[PDB]
Design a protein around this ligand. Structure first.
Ligand SMILES: CCCCCCCCCCCCCCCCCCCC(=O)O[C@H](COC(=O)CCCCCCCCCCCCCC)COP(=O)(O)OCCN
Ligand SMILES: CCCCCCCCCCCCCCCCCCCC(=O)O[C@H](COC(=O)CCCCCCCCCCCCCC)COP(=O)(O)OCCN
Ligand SMILES: CC(=O)O[C@H]1C[C@@]2(C)[C@@H](C[C@@H](O)[C@H]3[C@@]4(C)CC[C@@H](O)[C@@H](C)[C@@H]4CC[C@@]32C)/C1=C(\CCC=C(C)C)C(=O)O
Ligand SMILES: CCCCCCCCCCCCO[C@@H]1O[C@H](CO)[C@@H](O[C@H]2O[C@H](CO)[C@@H](O)[C@H](O)[C@H]2O)[C@H](O)[C@H]1O
Ligand SMILES: CCCCCCCCCCCCO[C@@H]1O[C@H](CO)[C@@H](O[C@H]2O[C@H](CO)[C@@H](O)[C@H](O)[C@H]2O)[C@H](O)[C@H]1O
Ligand SMILES: CCCCCCCCCCCCO[C@@H]1O[C@H](CO)[C@@H](O[C@H]2O[C@H](CO)[C@@H](O)[C@H](O)[C@H]2O)[C@H](O)[C@H]1O
Ligand SMILES: CCCCCCCCCCCCO[C@@H]1O[C@H](CO)[C@@H](O[C@H]2O[C@H](CO)[C@@H](O)[C@H](O)[C@H]2O)[C@H](O)[C@H]1O
Ligand SMILES: CCCCCCCCCCCCO[C@@H]1O[C@H](CO)[C@@H](O[C@H]2O[C@H](CO)[C@@H](O)[C@H](O)[C@H]2O)[C@H](O)[C@H]1O
Ligand SMILES: CCCCCCCCCC(=O)OC[C@H](CO)OC(=O)CCCCCCCCC
Ligand SMILES: CCCCCCCCCC[N+](C)(C)[O-]
Ligand SMILES: CCCCCCCCCC[N+](C)(C)[O-]
Ligand SMILES: CCCCCCCCCCCC
Ligand SMILES: CCCCCCCCCC
Ligand SMILES: CCCCCCCC
Ligand SMILES: CCCCCCCC
Ligand SMILES: [Cl-]
Lengths: 156, 1034, 144, 96, 48, 48, 48, 48
């Protein structure tokens, strides 16, 4: 859309903290998005850049912004094992039970890549362990099929 | 040997005749090209996996081929790309001097044995192994002006009617179609398919069954029943030939009785094989033919033959079809040759005038006018013998040698004319004494100049191949000139020159020539008095010399170096680069603005714009394209403001306004075959299975570190593409098995519809062409369309993709690079202004050693070539000086006197550096070879001065100063005669503004400037060198 | 005899025989080499910290060293003293019989579910007018 | 296998022939396509041509065409080798 | 086990193998080490 | 000289109606009239 | 056969000139060559 | 070159006798070779 919006999308992805800091000062659109519907918070959460996640939230970024397939920044952070960002997003009011268009929660994704710390954090902030995707599959169902014993203990 | 041919002038004439015919024959049947083979032999393996992402192609094709490239001889390195257009390119670069044909068959043989390990779809498409020798003679564009034909329609016409006849034309080695011949396109509709309970699997099964070649047999075939009257072949089913026939393909018979045909579930048309590229010529649909010379062919003859064949194709073209010539090297080569032939003829005319001005009889002026052509013709015979071509490098090699050729002719005749005047001897005896004074020196000069030029041929790689063109041309011309100077010119001098009575210096003559003789005789006495004064105060001139040597050393460092000067070639190109994820239509809108600018704002200059949507050099994709701007003739574009230099800078400035598109114009490099060749070429390598993302992070770390040293490194960036959003879709195996849907039906349905599928071949108007099934655009655009595709289960129920699939956005590479079998990322960049590329490389190596564990690096291309060419440099420079010294030591029978000659070198080089710096030029190859011919001719002048001085001391028992003053007095006229002719000879090259003037300027200015100082300084400094050296030793 | 031409002539004939060979023999890769019978040198590789087994070292050499030595000019043939790793599915017939399955079912499943699928693109050419999205479609990829 | 001269010529002979452009020292190229499905394309080269390099250049050019051929033609194999037209001798064998 | 290609230079190919091995050593896992338990080339160098 | 050819036209619609696959038709016609190479066998030590 | 007959004129031409120039160089003459080369037809007519 | 005094002999099946018959023929040749220690030494098969 806007000129600085594109530059914030690029800078958030690349993790250029000092450029984001300047763009926040010059009123760059925190709710600018890709063709796929990824905000700078999505890109920062995906590529694991912690500083920028915190900065964007202070500048009134939508913590529960969803892409064209219904995925929130918490989905990306929980899926790609960014524990610090998962905690930060949850403190700024991230929907822990948010479903994408497939009914896949951040818990499902975290369980699938087997991130033990992140599953516990999501559960602490009240993650629905019994939540099913479009195939009726829980995080527990993912853990037994993946053969993760340590994970299967926590989700019972 | 001169004494032999003075008594035998007929023998001398025969040798001249044999040299003339041998050379004349060579000029008829020598190959003519713009440039010779310079780049080392490289073989390129190429393949297409239709509808494949970069990773799929890499992990099923690229790695399997790379793993099998063993037991191939003389491989330097191997690099590959795997991209999201379903394409892989593996380039194997070989040692210089490798047989390219042997290299190609060895690569192709290892691929053949690897073919069974590749996917069916890739085996079916085929894997092309070809010599990566990209050097087009011309690009013939074919367009449609009356809007009746699409680009696909034009491409197919050119394939069927034009391409093969051009391939068969004389001197045409390779022909490349810019587009595809027709393909039978089945454009499937998922709504129509679901209504009749069908899938792409059913369409592919039906097309294979009903478009095929069925083998039958024979009536009355052997072994027969004895008494059989007839033997005939049985013809069964053969391939389909029409869109109508593909329309009538039966998919199923319904229970009610009605038939479901292929035309009921798909639009059927002849289209292109792929729609990645949209070629347009001034907004109109276009195709074309990229044509290359066959080895040993003539550029001018071939180009004429191509036009003659296109001419007799004119009458059969459909209405609106036209031929155009957006790129043609032949006009440029046509001028390159003519402008050199003009210099060689003018140079002979100038010698005639200068020879007449001083010697003032027509009989003397003929002797060089004969001898120089005889040597130049002879040179062509020796080029032909060494298997060389007539090209830009070999041609300017002769122009740089014309100073050395002219001197050999002048020196010999002048010295006979002098000896006749001073001692009163008749021509035959005077020639015999004259040759006695210089024959030893001329043979000495031949050895010295060989030592200067021959080592230049032994540089390795691309740069060494360019230097070898000048080396063999100059050494050959110079060597023949000496053979001719000892055989022919003596003979001519002894039989053609008129006697001169003792003391007759033409002072008694009247008019202009009388005035000139008395003027020049004064100036000679002024000169000898002046040297007398210089030889009293030698100490001062050694201090003035060290200022010249320091002045040289400064300019040598301050003057920025290049390879070859950019030329107004009549063409240039504009790169259009939209952001990653941008569509074909968005790119077309930018190219249309670019095409509009050039035909509007540069309507006087620009003839045509060839807009190509979907092909950038950085990588293929919808978000990139290039416009190839063809200009009007050099004559119609007057002044520097209407050249490629000026238009480039205006276009770049103009297009910098455009948002959401990086657009800029730039001129073609002199040798397109060699590439750009400036700065360095770095390869960052994953040596420990880190993966794409960890190599990305390591690359970004190296790029960020490079940006912190702008004093050393400038424009340090990746050559590759960046990760893009890609649509990850997960097929649920459990759900598929539950509903009774096979994975092979799911993956075929997804691939065939969304990616396309090459089914089999059909025959269109007696020409075999491919059949593709693919979804009609409407139903393969967005994630929502995935749900509209149905797959039949075992029980006969139709299941949508939504039932057994989930999808999400994630990032992946649209172009995966590899170097020597390991994953890599190519980084380009150049040394910052003032620093050398050697320093830049040394820093990049240091920065690289502080990257994460398991990340290695290597140098490729120009950097691989330059890093091993730099190793040779010092040893070749050393051998040259050592051999020059040893040749002069043998000539003079002295270990010290050599230094008197060898001290002349800086006197030529200073004026060359002043002229180059003043005119705003570079230290390029033309300048560098120009320095050697300047140093050679100044060294030659110095050798004859020292020879005459030493012989007067040795034979006539004269004093040091007496002999030196007498020597330089005798050598003043011939030095000034050669210098006057040769400086006027290269004057047009200096001022030249027209086509190929960048090369002519690079040649002339470094010679004219070098010759003005080499002449003016040497006539005063050489006597100083001789006296100071002779005093210091013995 | 020019061994380059001898190799070219032998392989031209082998290529007529190639398609008549069993599919299993083709898929192991047939090799044509022009080398001495005798070894120039043996390059051994050990682990001084005993952190890697015989199998681990052989895989490292096969996957990180061999191919570059094999491509080096003058190297006619390279014998790995050991084996590169493969994914070993070690079948149990007691448990196969239990679920009414055979090695044929195992092989079919590995082909179905260890696949690298070419799935085309969103907004692929030729596109509809006014298309803004262009992205690769990633379906199944090789197991790791 | 099983194809008539006309089908074989259109699908194999022309496909190969149109890829045989710009081979060094090529004097002329004769070829025939017949009812048994056989193609023979003889390229004759200038006197003093290295027959081994000729073979190599022809093989390299053919393998560009190879995948454009029908897959039954590919599965039979395509031989590129030096040829001669005349019989040196006929060795006869009989039972007595 | 490395065998010379037909007609290949023994010492020059051995030098090239050692150069290519030298490029790999820096990126070895901990403990891994090249040893030369059989080489016919050192005899050629010392005897010459 | 040009030879007479016996052109057989298989009606696939009529074949599908009677419930016979065109693969079985093609192989029957081909095998019977032209002959069909199935596989190799061993004749006294030699593959034929 | 076509080639053999096309190139013969050139072969005779260059052969005569080479024999001429070789005689001129050997005997330091133009008159001894011209005197000799006039004999060629006396021989050629006998062959024909 | 060889092993100074060594020889490399090939026993050929010329008439499709088969492996067993060629094995018997080999054993017959090895038996007879053993009964001339004065002339032949270490005559053994290279095979398995
Ligand atoms: C691997 C590359 C090899 C390249 C080789 C190049 C081709 C070489 C061809 C072979 C030529 C060899 C000739 C040898 C014969 C000369 C020695 C005999 C001299 C002799 O007794 O004859 C007298 C000439 O002697 C004299 O007075 C001396 C004159 C000698 C004449 C030599 C003629 C050679 C002509 C060849 C053509 C030119 C080729 C280019 C170099 C006749 O004397 P007279 O009293 O009858 O006449 C008036 C004399 N003033
Ligand atoms: C396949 C197609 C290819 C076709 C190519 C054709 C190439 C051309 C062939 C070669 C041509 C030969 C030309 C010879 C010209 C000779 C002129 C006759 C002069 C003459 O008879 O006088 C002589 C004296 O000459 C003297 O005193 C000598 C003075 C020096 C001679 C000057 C003239 C030479 C000019 C040559 C230039 C030719 C350029 C052609 C490219 C007498 O001799 P004598 O024996 O009676 O005297 C002995 C007395 N005691
Ligand atoms: C008179 C003049 O100007 O030079 C003309 C004259 C020219 C130098 C010709 C090129 C070439 O045949 C020359 C050779 C060596 C050709 C072979 C022999 O038969 C020679 C006896 C002949 C003498 C001069 C000639 C006939 C010229 C050219 C080059 C032609 C090519 C282009 C692309 C313009 C030229 O015009 O530039
Ligand atoms: C005597 C003065 C000194 C000599 C200086 C020579 C200048 C440099 C010459 C450069 C080469 C000229 O270019 C050369 O001649 C002509 C160009 O139309 C072409 O000539 C071509 O066509 C003519 C047509 O009659 C044929 O006779 C000839 O067999 C054929 O090769 C050559 O293919 C080309 O290679
Ligand atoms: C003292 C004067 C100098 C006399 C030198 C006499 C040497 C003359 C050459 C002798 C014959 C051998 O040299 C022969 O020359 C012809 C052209 O003339 C070359 O002819 C060929 O050159 C190149 C390279 O091969 C081919 O691409 C081209 O198709 C063809 O013209 C031959 O490649 C070469 O073998
Ligand atoms: C000035 C711009 C041009 C620069 C390019 C030319 C550089 C080379 C200089 C050549 C001209 C030298 O000119 C020449 O110099 C010498 C001394 O140096 C003079 O010699 C005179 O002065 C010297 C002083 O030491 C006396 O020893 C000598 O007896 C006397 O005659 C000559 O009378 C003069 O003609
Ligand atoms: C009368 C005329 C005589 C002309 C003489 C012409 C001779 C020129 C050819 C010989 C030089 C070419 O051979 C050259 O050898 C040197 C070493 O000796 C090599 O140089 C190599 O070894 C030297 C050792 O001194 C190293 O410092 C250098 O890093 C390395 O590149 C070059 O790679 C090679 O190009
Ligand atoms: C004692 C020292 C003297 C040494 C002198 C040596 C001279 C050698 C001369 C070699 C001339 C080159 O030989 C060259 O061959 C070719 C054949 O391919 C001939 O080519 C000729 O025949 C073909 C027939 O197809 C014609 O199409 C062509 O137009 C015609 O010119 C040339 O006419 C001839 O000039
Ligand atoms: C009379 C003595 C002359 C010796 C100098 C010539 C040395 C040439 C060596 C050589 O082959 O180099 C080729 C090279 C191309 O890469 O040519 C060049 O780059 C020109 C080098 C400049 C001249 C050298 C002297 C500098 C001032 C002292
Ligand atoms: C191989 C080096 C040759 C150097 C050049 C020799 C010239 C010799 C001329 C001098 N002379 C013999 C007349 O005294
Ligand atoms: C007149 C001297 C001819 C020298 C020709 C070049 C010699 C081969 C060197 C090739 N190369 C530099 C690649 O090693
Ligand atoms: C390789 C260079 C050789 C140079 C030889 C110079 C020897 C000079 C000695 C003279 C002593 C008077
Ligand atoms: C290369 C060293 C120069 C030596 C000069 C010797 C002069 C002769 C001795 C008096
Ligand atoms: C003193 C005799 C010289 C002979 C030279 C011959 C050159 C072809
Ligand atoms: C005062 C300097 C005079 C030099 C004149 C020489 C001209 C060649
Ligand atoms: Cl006169």
């Amino acid at each position: 859309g806007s000129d600085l919006g594109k530059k914030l999308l690029e800078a958030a992805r690349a993790g250029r903290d000092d450029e984001v800091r300047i763009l926040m000062a010059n009123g760059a659109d925190v709710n600018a998005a890709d063709v796929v519907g990824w905000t700078p918070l999505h890109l920062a959460a995906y590529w694991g850049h912690l500083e920028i996640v915190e900065v964007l939230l202070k500048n009134g970024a939508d913590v529960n912004a969803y892409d064209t397939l219904g995925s929130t920044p918490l989905h990306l952070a929980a899926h790609f094992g960014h524990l610090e960002i998962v905690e930060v997003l949850l403190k700024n009011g991230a929907d822990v039970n948010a479903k994408d268009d497939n009914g896949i929660t951040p818990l499902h994704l975290a369980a699938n890549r087997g991130h033990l710390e992140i599953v516990e954090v999501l559960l602490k902030y009240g993650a629905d362990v019994n939540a099913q995707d479009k195939f009726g599959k829980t995080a527990f169902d993912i853990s037994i099929n993946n053969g993760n014993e340590d994970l299967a203990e926590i989700l019972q | 040997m001169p004494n032999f041919f003075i008594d035998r002038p007929i023998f001398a004439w025969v040798i001249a005749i044999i040299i003339m015919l041998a050379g004349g024959l060579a000029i008829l049947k020598l190959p003519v090209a713009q440039y010779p083979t310079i780049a080392p032999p490289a073989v390129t393996i190429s393949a297409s996996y239709p509808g494949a992402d970069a990773k799929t192609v890499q992990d099923t094709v690229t790695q399997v081929i790379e793993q099998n490239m063993n037991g191939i001889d003389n491989l330097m390195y191997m690099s590959s790309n795997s991209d999201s257009t379903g394409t892989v390119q593996i380039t194997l670069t070989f040692e210089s001097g490798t047989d390219a044909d042997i290299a190609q068959v060895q690569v192709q043989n290892k691929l053949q044995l690897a073919m069974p390990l590749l996917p069916q779809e890739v085996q079916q498409q085929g894997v092309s192994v070809e010599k990566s020798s990209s050097s087009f003679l011309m690009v013939v564009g074919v367009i449609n002006t009356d809007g009746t034909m699409t680009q696909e329609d034009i491409s197919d016409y050119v394939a069927a009617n034009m391409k093969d006849a051009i391939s068969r034309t004389s001197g045409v080695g390779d022909v490349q179609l810019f587009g595809s011949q027709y393909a039978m396109r089945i454009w499937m509709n998922p709504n129509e398919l679901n209504k009749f309970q069908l899938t792409p699997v059913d369409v592919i099964t039906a097309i294979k069954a009903q478009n095929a070649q069925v083998a039958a047999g024979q009536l009355g075939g052997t072994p027969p029943v004895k008494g059989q009257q007839l033997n005939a072949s049985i013809i069964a089913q053969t391939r389909l030939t029409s869109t109508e026939e593909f329309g009538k393909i039966l998919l199923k018979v319904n229970q009610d009785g009605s038939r479901v045909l292929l035309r009921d579930v798909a639009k059927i048309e002849l289209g292109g094989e792929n729609y990645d590229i949209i070629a347009e010529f001034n907004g109109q649909p276009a195709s074309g033919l990229g044509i290359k010379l066959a080895t040993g062919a003539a550029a001018l003859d071939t180009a004429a033959a191509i036009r003659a064949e296109l001419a007799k194709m004119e009458p059969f073209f459909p209405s609106g079809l036209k031929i155009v010539y957006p790129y043609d090297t032949t006009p440029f080569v046509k001028i390159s040759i003519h402008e050199v032939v003009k210099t060689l003829v003018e140079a002979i005319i100038l010698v005639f005038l200068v020879m007449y001005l001083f010697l003032q009889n027509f009989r003397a002026t003929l002797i060089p006018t004969i001898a120089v052509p005889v040597v130049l013709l002879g040179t062509f015979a020796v080029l032909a013998a060494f298997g060389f071509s007539i090209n830009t490098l070999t041609m300017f090699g002769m122009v740089l040698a014309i100073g050395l050729l002219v001197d050999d002719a002048i020196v010999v005749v002048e010295n006979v004319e002098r000896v006749m005047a001073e001692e009163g001897l008749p021509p035959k005896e005077a020639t015999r004494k004259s040759m006695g004074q210089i024959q030893g020196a001329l043979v000495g000069i031949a050895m010295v100049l060989s030592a200067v030029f021959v080592p230049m041929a032994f540089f390795g790689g691309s740069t060494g191949a360019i230097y070898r063109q000048f080396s063999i041309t100059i050494v050959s011309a110079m060597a023949l000139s000496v053979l001719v100077a000892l055989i022919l010119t003596p003979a001519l001098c002894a039989t053609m020159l008129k006697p001169i009575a003792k003391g007759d210096h033409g002072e008694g003559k009247k008019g202009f020539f009388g005035w000139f003789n008395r003027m020049f005789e004064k100036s000679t006495h002024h000169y000898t008095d002046s040297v007398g004064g210089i030889l009293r105060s030698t100490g001062r001139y050694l201090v003035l010399y060290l200022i010249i040597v320091v002045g040289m050393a400064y300019l040598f460092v301050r003057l920025p170096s290049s390879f070859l000067p950019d030329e107004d070639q009549g063409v240039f190109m504009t790169m259009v680069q939209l952001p990653a994820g941008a569509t074909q239509e968005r790119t077309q809108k930018v190219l249309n603005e670019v095409t509009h600018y050039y035909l509007t704002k540069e309507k006087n200059n620009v003839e045509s714009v060839f807009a190509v949507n979907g092909f950038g050099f950085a990588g293929r994709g919808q978000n990139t394209g290039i416009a190839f701007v063809s200009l009007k003739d050099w004559a119609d574009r007057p002044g520097e403001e209407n050249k490629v230099e000026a238009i480039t800078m205006r276009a770049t400035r103009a297009f910098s306004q455009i948002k959401d598109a990086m657009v800029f114009a730039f001129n073609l490099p002199a040798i397109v075959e060699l590439g750009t060749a400036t700065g360095f070429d770095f390869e960052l390598i994953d040596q420990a299975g880190l993966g794409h993302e960890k190599l990305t992070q390591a690359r970004n770390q190296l790029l960020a570190e490079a940006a912190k040293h702008p004093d050393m490194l400038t424009s340090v960036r990746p050559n590759g593409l960046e990760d893009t959003p890609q649509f990850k879709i997960d097929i649920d195996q459990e759900k598929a098995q539950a509903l009774g849907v096979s994975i092979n039906d799911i993956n075929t349905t997804l691939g065939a519809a969304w990616g396309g599928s090459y089914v089999n071949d059909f025959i269109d108007r007696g020409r075999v062409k491919k059949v593709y099934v693919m979804s009609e655009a409407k139903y393969r655009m967005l994630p929502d369309d995935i749900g509209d595709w149905y797959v039949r289960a075992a029980d006969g129920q139709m299941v949508p993709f939504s039932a057994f699939s989930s999808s999400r956005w994630e990032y992946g590479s649209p172009r995966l690079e590899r170097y020597n079998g390991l994953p890599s990322m190519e980084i380009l960049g150049q040394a910052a202004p003032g620093k050398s590329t050697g320093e830049a490389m040394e820093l990049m190596e240091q920065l690289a050693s502080k990257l994460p564990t398991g990340v290695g690096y290597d140098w490729t291309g120009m950097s691989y070539q330059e890093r091993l060419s730099g190793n040779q440099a010092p040893s070749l420079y050393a051998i040259s000086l050592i051999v020059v010294f040893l040749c002069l030591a043998a000539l003079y029978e002295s270990w010290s006197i050599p230094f008197s000659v060898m001290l002349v070198v800086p006197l030529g080089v200073i004026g060359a550096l002043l002229a180059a710096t003043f005119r705003g030029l570079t230290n390029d190859v033309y300048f560098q070879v120009g320095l050697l011919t300047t140093i050679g001719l100044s060294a030659k002048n110095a050798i004859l001065i020292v020879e005459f001085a030493k012989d007067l001391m040795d034979k006539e028992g004269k004093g040091l100063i007496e002999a030196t003053l007498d020597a330089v007095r005798m050598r003043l006229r011939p030095i000034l005669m050669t210098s006057l002719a040769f400086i006027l000879g290269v004057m047009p090259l200096v001022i030249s503004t027209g086509a190929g003037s960048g090369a002519q300027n690079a040649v002339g200015t470094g010679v004219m400037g070098g010759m003005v100082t080499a002449t003016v300084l040497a006539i005063f400094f050489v006597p100083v060198f001789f006296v100071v050296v002779r005093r210091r030793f013995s």
